[PDB]
Design a protein around this ligand. Structure first.
Ligand code: CLA
Ligand code: CLA
Ligand code: CLA
Ligand code: CLA
Ligand code: CLA
Ligand code: CLA
Ligand code: CLA
Ligand SMILES: CCCCCCCCCCCCCCCCCC(=O)OC[C@H](CO[C@@H]1O[C@H](CO)[C@H](O)[C@H](O)[C@H]1O)OC(=O)CCCCCCCCCCCCCCCCC
Ligand SMILES: CCCCCCCCCCCCCCCC(=O)OC[C@H](COP(=O)(O)OC[C@@H](O)CO)OC(=O)CCCCCCCCCCCCCCC
Ligand SMILES: CC1=C(/C=C/C(C)=C/C=C/C(C)=C/C=C/C=C(C)/C=C/C=C(C)/C=C/C2=C(C)CCCC2(C)C)C(C)(C)CCC1
Ligand SMILES: CC1=C(/C=C/C(C)=C/C=C/C(C)=C/C=C/C=C(C)/C=C/C=C(C)/C=C/C2=C(C)CCCC2(C)C)C(C)(C)CCC1
Lengths: 743, 80, 146, 131, 73, 132, 74
């Protein structure tokens, strides 16, 4: 009948604790029982690989839907806890009254073992750990005002968490959807693009227009939080709103009529940052979401469902083919509607890419009240979202490779774009290799050249703004374009989207919130290094996807799998030739890439933006503008950045920042610890274990689960894990400790 | 190039000859085992040194041993 | 329409006939280059190649070298170029010895010892002379103004 | 067909650490170390293919191929001994009204082709040659 | 480890403050801050944005070493 | 009799023309799509098929795939630059995994792996323990 | 052998760059060279030792010379 219908099987899986007591039930091999320690590790590594646990897409699909509900439940509990801790263990009320002086804190340590030192004198007759997630600013923007409200949102969160968990159980054990239900992309997109995003934005705009905007205006004006009317009061008494925004008097009459102009009071396109709080005007944010909402809702009506009108994605994809691309995009629809791994690849890459964009756009255009001046929170958020993004992007590549090895079928892909790509893979990889070498030699060479020149007493031969100069002309041009846009290419706007492009210095509390950021030779040099790092990462990852099934060296790599240790010592050596290993190596380069980016942000900002400005025009940046002539050499980074900005962590003992010092050291230890897994091999360890077991046997006792050394692949994984934790952890402490002081 | 040797502990499981990626091993008639067959390495000039054969042997210690040695284009798996 | 086809109609060779690989433009340019052109003797082939490469090499040294701002900068640039040409010539000599051997017969085949030696000689003369020409040209630059 | 063409190579097995020439020789008789590309109207790799107007891609012009007819011959020559052993055993087992090994071969291979002949047990052969 | 111990102990003795080692050598942070960090100031300033001294060669080699070490990885 | 393929950059190189080359042949009952070791997809012809590769392993890998299609009549040859051809697999007409009377043992040692001689004993001899 | 690793036919007959790399790092393992008798081994080692001694003395000579010609000993 209808193309789109709901098909669900009742009572699919019985709920019992029997399987719980039978570890390894999901796998046929593991189910037999443990005979060596490898079984234990394999149990945990194959837990969520449903494709290998079952051969039916319906079953795999059912598990994924329910598992997702589980994650949602966890996320809800997390958010709930944060709000609760902000209601019972925080100084929000005090901060709300004096946001500039009091420091945000929402965690308190018990008075055990001198750990109390960690409870700092943040302010407002309160002692606790200074948090840096930015909760206080967000709550202020929403218009919380009280701590009772925080408690209630916490309760809502707990309730929501439970509902999600029930949903997971219900849709797996009692009402499990069939495969036909899952395979309805057009419907899903229509619903998710119009309901989840469109209605979501519209609903949020409602809160912002009726509750947040009015309260925040009063707060900024000076009204004491206790004197601001309760949220419900604004919703009921239109007169009160009319006082603040003199258009609510007209009511919704202007809206139904075409006179949307009358609502210019609260819907505006001002641009720039609020002078008092140093954040984007909420009026603009309200119009933003309202506009986006309309767009999303309209977009949700593009695909056919059950009424004839609409587009069928298959047709659109197949029609787009050209002279240089054979059958074009034929075959892609089936792939994306019959392979979860393929979908995850695209979705995961885009999600990670978004996080990176959020990081850039959220510092240049501060979105929350009193966020820019809080340097600690700004740095924390930028770095956090930069990392999340990197991991996700690499993950997308990984799952893309899993697709090629597990779901790719030659029959369904003849002369399509995918086939043609795999037919000239040598050309693609060869060229990218060259691009990477070119960029790397030229970009890093600049730094080495400068180091040598400065050391040889020849400063006039360096690539600097005072010698041979490499100016970023293109970027400088775009900046000017964006600066002059308000009033020209953007006539109805009133100010620059960001003061970074150009403008005046916005200061809040004697501290600089935003200032024009200029680009010179040093910036050129660093930006091109970023390009090199990203390009190399792509090379490793793309090579893995393209050569996943076969290679000149190992023609039958596909049969070996996605995660095999090697093929042997032959052919000169075939170690680490799997696609999994390419992901393994890619993560190391992603670490390098992101590390450089976050360091660039930290030094540039502390040198050319952040700081204090006097009543008159005197700007004193935190580091003093050293970036221009010091970041052009490697010695400069080691001395004027790492060595100098690390004075805080190393001298944190005896203070509330002591934890960071300990973690800094601990992270270094873990990083080094990992190098033993990354440089050694299973053979040595297995033999050592044999001798150790001899001792236990000599005393008449030994485990039946014979002790064995970690697999080759696991060894690499353990090493990478500790390596990443240690490296990121070290910077984490370094940044946070430094930031607390600079703030 | 490489040297592959078979020992008397073979049981004629044929698993090794079914794993070689370059047809270096064969099953020849023999009387020392119940199966009445033993493995041989007639074409070691095509051994790449993968050691897949060894991984397939079921005997306590490999009855088929591959000792890596002189390297040629064939043994180094060079298509170029 | 397919603008990419198997090279030489061999579906199994490791190459493809793309617009870049096999277009009238590419074919024409490569056919008339000194290296592959028809009729040129080994010496002349080297000469043309050398004349071309020497002229553009004096620039980098002259404008970005250690003594660029010195009055004798151009002279220094010339000397540097000559040095680089010598290094490259050593390479050519050594390559020929290893690739071709010690006694040859075919003759007039760039790929023989005698022909290679002649080719190398041409390169040296052309390169050094070309660099000198650039020195003379860069000594006084025309503004082409009426 | 020179069955020893491959064996007749320049490779010399070392004392210890080398499997040897094996069954079909360890290396090609010809040396891969040939020259590079040459100008139009010239040849480099001995019996190379003229690149015509595109000498740069001459190495992509195939000159080495397999004739299907010739393919049959190589199959027969390299498997001659095996066929001999097979027919010999068939002869040993008191063939019905046997004639000559060669004659029997022709008769037995006239039917059951040649490949099938090579893959058949003496028992099956005798059953087949009952007539 | 052996060489670090000898150097730091002697450095403090030569400097006239044997106490620094005596008290800060008990925990790891001391070694990092009062030895590696404190005594690296002359080296990292062999060549700076303001000039150079005879320790420039030693400064350059220090960075050179880090490169080779990491390249090994 | 070449299968239908549109070309790839993963085909053979100079070695195939100056050192050595390989070729596989088989017969099919239907036109079907297979994946070639070089990279890509091709359609076999209804009948005889011939394909050239640069390595024996590449050829034998394809044979494995062919067996899935229920094709067991494949033959592999090595063509030298001068035109000489060597029949390589199935060498005696019978696949190696099946014992064929008439095949002699090679490289066989009549003792357990642990009975090989001690390295010191064969010092300054040139032979190895496993060849001793 | 007729290639770079004259002491090893195996490496010499190698068609790759390994021939060069390994020949350099297996040069002083005289005991494993093709056709090595114990007598020759000892004799070659003895001579090699003379060379090492010479290098040590040349090194010492240089220090004295450079200090004397370009130093401030007096
Ligand atoms: C500091 C340590 C270090 C260095 C320098 C390199 C260097 C390199 N890695 Mg690498 N890598 C490292 C650590 C390092 N790695 C670690 C720890 C890992 C483990 C995860 C890896 C894993 C890894 C992978 C998986 C990949 C690389 C790749 C690369 C290459 C990138 C291409 C390039 O920029 O060439 C330029 C190289 C330079 C060193 C630039 C500096 C050299 C000077 C400044 C330029 C001019 C010098 C000139 C050429 C010669 C001068 C003559 C005279 C000095 C004698 C390059 C050779 C990629 C590759 O090979 O693709 C191309 C690749 O795929 N790396
Ligand atoms: C993201 C979630 C999250 C996180 C990380 C924290 C973290 C913290 N909370 Mg908190 N909290 C949360 C959510 C969260 N909370 C929520 C949602 C609520 C509302 C209910 C609260 C309510 C709350 C209160 C009321 C208090 C805290 C406190 C604390 C701190 C001490 C935690 C503690 O009890 O240590 C000690 C840990 C324990 C006593 C638990 C015992 C350990 C158990 C037994 C191990 C688990 C057994 C294991 C799972 C067995 C498996 C069986 C199988 C069936 C699974 C710590 C910083 C305390 C604090 O800060 O005091 C100053 C405090 O008083 N929280
Ligand atoms: C108490 C209620 C209950 C009971 C008795 C069962 C019982 C069962 N479920 Mg089920 N399930 C439930 C609730 C329940 N479920 C809920 C609420 C969900 C939604 C999330 C699911 C989702 C679900 C799926 C998707 C699958 C099962 C499966 C199974 C069967 C195998 C048990 C198993 O895999 O052990 C699991 C035992 C554990 C202890 C795992 C717990 C792991 C925790 C939740 C991770 C998070 C902990 C922490 C927060 C993260 C780290 C810190 C078994 C019949 C599987 C099966 O056999 O299907 C045929 C299967 O594929 N269930
Ligand atoms: C308009 C209807 C609608 C909405 C709102 C959603 C929303 C969602 N779907 Mg979805 N879906 C829909 C229709 C819809 N779907 C249809 C028709 C199909 C079949 C074609 C699917 C098939 C589908 C699959 C297969 C999956 C999803 C998933 C998801 C979640 C993605 C994760 C996320 O963004 O977290 C955002 C989280 C929240 C916003 C939390 C709230 C979530 C609740 C359920 C919102 C319900 C409305 C709420 C009660 C508000 C009522 C308004 C009232 C107050 C006035 C998200 C909650 C994924 C998932 O994780 O599911 C568990 C997933 O795997 N959907
Ligand atoms: C989902 C979002 C949302 C929600 C729930 C509300 C809800 C409300 N709005 Mg509101 N509003 C919204 C978005 C929203 N608005 C947006 C985006 C704008 C900008 C165009 C406005 C502009 C607006 C004005 C100008 C006024 C309201 C008013 C009202 C109230 C009475 C509406 C009415 O007559 O009944 C609903 C009737 C129909 C749908 C017909 C009600 C509480 C009125 C009021 O009394 O303010 C408190 C009023 O004067 N709204
Ligand atoms: C949307 C996110 C997402 C989802 C749903 C999946 C889902 C899946 N991935 Mg995948 N992946 C992702 C993101 C994701 N991945 C990312 C971002 C990366 C890049 C790092 C990868 C890299 C990756 C690889 C390389 C592999 C998978 C595999 C798998 C499959 C099995 C997972 C498994 O073994 O479970 C078991 C899960 C675990 C054992 C994880 C436990 C957590 C470990 C111990 C790390 C914990 C670190 C912790 C945070 C540090 C705390 C520090 C503290 C102690 C001090 C499954 C389909 C595997 C597979 O076979 O696919 C078919 C596989 O080989 N994925
Ligand atoms: C890789 C990056 C890099 C770059 C660009 C430079 C650049 C320079 N260095 Mg430096 N240097 C570097 C790394 C680098 N250095 C490193 C890593 C070290 C440490 C070993 C040094 C150590 C060093 C010293 C000690 C000195 C220099 C000097 C110089 C200058 C002289 C240039 C010269 O003679 O080149 C000659 C260049 C060429 C002959 C060829 C250039 C490449 C051509 C243009 C490529 C053309 C490609 C073409 C477009 C392809 C398409 C063709 C098609 C269209 C037909 C110049 C400013 C000298 C100086 O005075 O300093 C200012 C000097 O004394 N350098
Ligand atoms: C030239 C003949 C006369 C030169 C003369 O009279 O010197 C007289 C002049 C002296 O010019 C000098 O230039 C210096 C730098 O500016 C000084 O500053 C003075 O101007 C001046 O004294 O010589 C020349 O500079 C011109 C000679 C240029 C030669 C052309 C290149 C020829 C090829 C050279 C490479 C040879 C290697 C192999 C060749 C194949
Ligand atoms: C980039 C320019 C561009 O987009 O050209 C696009 C070019 C022509 O595409 P077609 O119009 O023929 O094919 C259309 C379909 O692919 C759907 O758009 O495709 C290529 O061949 C890319 C070649 C590799 C890219 C070289 C680097
Ligand atoms: C924070 C949080 C949360 C949340 C909460 C909320 C979110 C609340 C709210 C709720 C709400 C409050 C909602 C609302 C909604 C509304 C809406 C969504 C509206 C709509 C509209 C409409 C539907 C309209 C329609 C129409 C039109 C279009 C026009 C004409 C007429 C009509 C009617 C037809 C929770 C607790 C969960 C958890 C924790 C966190
Ligand atoms: C981008 C492009 C292009 C290209 C360009 C180029 C690449 C150029 C180059 C150019 C060049 C690179 C040139 C060169 C020239 C050279 C010369 C002009 C030389 C001369 C010499 C002479 C004249 C002589 C000398 C001598 C001798 C021989 C010896 C004795 C002495 C003397 C001195 C006499 C075109 C436009 C096409 C088009 C588009 C694309």
């Amino acid at each position: 009948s209808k193309n789109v219908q709901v098909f669900v099987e009742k009572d699919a899986v019985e709920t019992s604790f029997a399987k719980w007591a039978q570890p390894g039930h999901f796998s046929r091999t593991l189910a037999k029982g443990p005979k060596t320690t490898t079984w234990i590790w394999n149990l945990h590594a194959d837990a969520h690989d449903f494709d290998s646990q079952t051969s039916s897409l319906e079953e795999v699909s059912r598990k994924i839907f329910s598992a997702h509900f589980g994650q949602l439940a966890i996320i809800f509990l997390w958010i709930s806890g944060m709000h609760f801790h902000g209601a019972y263990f925080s100084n929000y009320s005090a901060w709300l009254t004096d946001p500039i002086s009091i420091k945000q804190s929402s965690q308190v340590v018990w008075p055990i073992v001198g750990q109390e030192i960690l409870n700092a004198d943040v302010g407002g007759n309160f002692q606790g750990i200074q948090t840096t997630s930015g909760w206080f600013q967000m709550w202020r923007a929403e218009g919380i005002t009280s701590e009772v409200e925080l408690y209630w949102t916490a309760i809502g969160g707990l309730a929501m968490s439970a509902i999600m968990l029930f949903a997971g159980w219900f849709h797996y054990h009692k009402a499990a959807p069939k495969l036909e239900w899952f395979q309805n992309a057009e419907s899903m997109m229509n619903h998710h693009l119009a309901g989840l995003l469109g209605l979501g934005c519209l609903s949020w705009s409602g809160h912002q227009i009726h509750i947040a905007l009015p309260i925040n205006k009063l707060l900024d004006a000076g009204v004491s939080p206790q004197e601001i009317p309760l949220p419900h009061e604004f919703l009921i008494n239109r007169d009160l709103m009319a006082q603040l925004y003199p258009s609510f008097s007209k009511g919704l009459a202007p809206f139904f009529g075409g006179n949307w102009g009358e609502y210019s009071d609260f819907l505006t396109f001002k641009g720039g940052l609020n002078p008092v709080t140093g954040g984007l005007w909420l009026s603009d944010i309200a119009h933003h979401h309202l506009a986006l909402s309309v767009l999303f809702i309209i977009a949700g009506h593009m695909y056919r469902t059950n009424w004839g009108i609409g587009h069928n994605m298959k047709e659109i994809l197949e029609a787009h083919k050209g002279p240089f691309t054979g059958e074009g995009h034929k075959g892609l629809y089936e792939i994306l509607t019959t392979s979860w791994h393929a979908q995850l690849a695209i979705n995961l890459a885009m999600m990670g890419s978004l996080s990176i964009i959020v990081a850039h756009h959220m510092y240049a255009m501060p979105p929350y009240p009193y966020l820019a001046t809080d340097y600690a929170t700004q740095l924390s958020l930028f770095t956090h979202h930069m990392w999340i993004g990197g991991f996700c992007v690499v993950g997308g590549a990984a799952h893309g490779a899993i697709f090629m090895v597990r779901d790719y079928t030659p029959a369904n892909n003849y002369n399509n774009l995918l086939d043609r790509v795999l037919r000239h893979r040598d050309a693609i990889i060869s060229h990218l290799n060259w691009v990477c070498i070119f960029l790397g030699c030229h970009a890093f060479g600049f730094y080495i050249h400068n180091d040598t020149m400065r050391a040889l007493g020849r400063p006039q031969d360096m690539f600097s703004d005072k010698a041979i100069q490499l100016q970023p002309i293109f970027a400088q041009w775009i900046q000017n374009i964006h600066l002059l846009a308000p009033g020209t290419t953007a006539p109805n706007a009133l100010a620059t989207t960001s003061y970074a492009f150009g403008g005046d210095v916005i200061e809040v509390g004697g501290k600089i919130a935003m200032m024009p950021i200029k680009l010179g030779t040093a910036d050129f040099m660093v930006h091109h290094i970023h390009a090199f790092t990203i390009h190399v990462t792509v090379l490793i990852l793309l090579k893995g996807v393209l050569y996943a099934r076969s290679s000149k060296l190992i023609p039958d790599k596909a049969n070996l799998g996605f995660r095999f240790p090697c093929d042997g010592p032959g052919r000169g050596g075939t170690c680490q030739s799997s696609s999994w290993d390419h992901v393994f190596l890619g993560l190391f380069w992603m670490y390098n890439s992101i590390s450089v980016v976050i360091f660039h942000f930290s030094w540039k900002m502390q040198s050319d933006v952040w700081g204090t400005i006097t009543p008159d025009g005197a700007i004193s940046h935190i580091t003093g503008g050293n970036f221009a002539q010091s970041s052009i050499t490697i010695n400069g980074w080691l001395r004027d950045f790492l060595w100098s900005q690390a004075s805080q962590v190393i001298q944190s003992y005896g203070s509330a920042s002591s934890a960071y010092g300990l973690i800094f050291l601990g992270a270094h230890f873990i990083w080094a610890f990992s190098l033993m897994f990354l440089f050694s091999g299973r053979g040595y360890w297995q033999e050592l274990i044999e001798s150790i077991v001899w001792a236990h046997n000599k005393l008449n006792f030994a485990p039946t689960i014979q002790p064995r050394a970690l697999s080759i692949t696991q060894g690499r994984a353990v090493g990478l894990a500790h390596y990443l934790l240690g490296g990121i952890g070290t910077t984490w402490a370094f940044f946070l400790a430094r930031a607390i002081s600079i703030t | 190039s490489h040297t592959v040797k078979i020992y008397d502990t073979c049981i004629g499981c044929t698993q090794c000859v079914r794993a070689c990626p370059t047809d270096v091993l064969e099953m020849v008639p023999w009387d020392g085992c119940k199966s009445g067959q033993i493995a041989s390495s007639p074409r070691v000039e095509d051994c790449v040194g993968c050691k897949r054969c060894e991984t397939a042997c079921p005997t306590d210690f490999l009855s088929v041993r591959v000792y890596l040695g002189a390297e040629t284009t064939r043994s180094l798996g060079l298509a170029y | 329409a397919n603008f990419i086809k198997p090279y030489n109609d061999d579906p199994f060779v490791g190459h493809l006939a793309t617009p870049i690989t096999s277009s009238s433009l590419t074919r024409a340019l490569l056919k008339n280059l000194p290296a592959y052109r028809f009729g040129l003797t080994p010496l002349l082939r080297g000469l043309e190649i050398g004349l071309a490469h020497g002229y553009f090499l004096i620039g980098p040294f002259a404008q970005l070298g250690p003594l660029r701002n010195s009055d004798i900068g151009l002279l220094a640039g010339f000397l540097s170029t000559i040095g680089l040409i010598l290094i490259l010539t050593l390479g050519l000599t050594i390559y020929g010895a290893a690739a071709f051997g010690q006694e040859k017969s075919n003759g007039s085949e760039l790929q023989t010892k005698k022909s290679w030696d002649q080719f190398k000689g041409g390169f040296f003369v052309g390169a050094c002379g070309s660099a000198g020409f650039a020195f003379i040209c860069l000594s006084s630059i025309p503004t082409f103004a009426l | 067909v020179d069955l020893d063409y491959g064996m007749k190579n320049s490779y010399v097995p070392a004392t210890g650490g080398d499997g040897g020439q094996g069954q079909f020789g360890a290396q090609s008789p010809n040396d891969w170390r040939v020259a590079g590309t040459s100008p139009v109207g010239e040849t480099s790799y001995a019996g190379a293919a003229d690149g015509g107007e595109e000498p740069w891609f001459a190495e992509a012009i195939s000159t080495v191929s397999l004739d299907l007819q010739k393919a049959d011959e190589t199959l027969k020559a390299f498997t001659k001994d095996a066929a001999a052993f097979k027919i010999e055993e068939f002869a040993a087992e008191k063939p019905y009204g046997f004639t000559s090994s060669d004659a029997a071969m022709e008769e037995l291979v006239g039917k059951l082709g040649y490949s099938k002949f090579l893959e058949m047990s003496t028992k099956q052969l005798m059953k087949t040659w009952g007539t | 480890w052996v060489t670090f111990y000898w150097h730091w102990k002697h450095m403090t003795i030569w400097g006239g403050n044997p106490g620094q080692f005596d008290e800060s050598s008990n925990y790891i942070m001391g070694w990092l801050r009062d030895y590696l960090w404190l005594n690296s100031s002359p080296l990292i300033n062999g060549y700076n944005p303001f000039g150079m001294n005879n320790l420039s060669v030693w400064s350059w080699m220090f960075l050179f070493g880090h490169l080779i070490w990491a390249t090994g990885f | 009799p070449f299968p239908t393929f549109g070309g790839s950059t993963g085909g053979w190189l100079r070695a195939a023309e100056v050192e050595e080359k390989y070729a596989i042949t088989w017969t099919s009952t239907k036109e079907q799509i297979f994946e070639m070791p070089t990279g890509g997809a091709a359609i076999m012809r209804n009948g005889e098929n011939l394909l050239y590769l640069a390595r024996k392993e590449q050829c034998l890998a394809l044979s494995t795939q062919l067996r899935t299609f229920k094709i067991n009549d494949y033959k592999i040859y090595r063509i030298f630059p001068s035109g000489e051809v060597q029949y390589l697999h199935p060498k005696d007409g019978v696949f190696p995994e099946k014992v064929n009377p008439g095949r002699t043992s090679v490289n066989s040692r009549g003792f357990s792996i642990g009975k090989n001689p001690n390295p010191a004993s064969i010092k300054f001899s040139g032979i190895t323990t496993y060849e001793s | 052998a007729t290639k770079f690793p004259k002491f090893s036919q195996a490496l010499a007959q190698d068609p790759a760059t390994r021939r060069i790399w390994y020949g350099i790092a297996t040069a002083h393992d005289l005991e494993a060279h093709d056709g090595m008798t114990e007598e020759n081994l000892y004799q070659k080692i003895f001579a090699s030792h003379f060379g090492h001694l010479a290098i040590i003395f040349l090194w010492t000579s240089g220090n004295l010379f450079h200090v004397a010609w370009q130093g401030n000993f007096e």
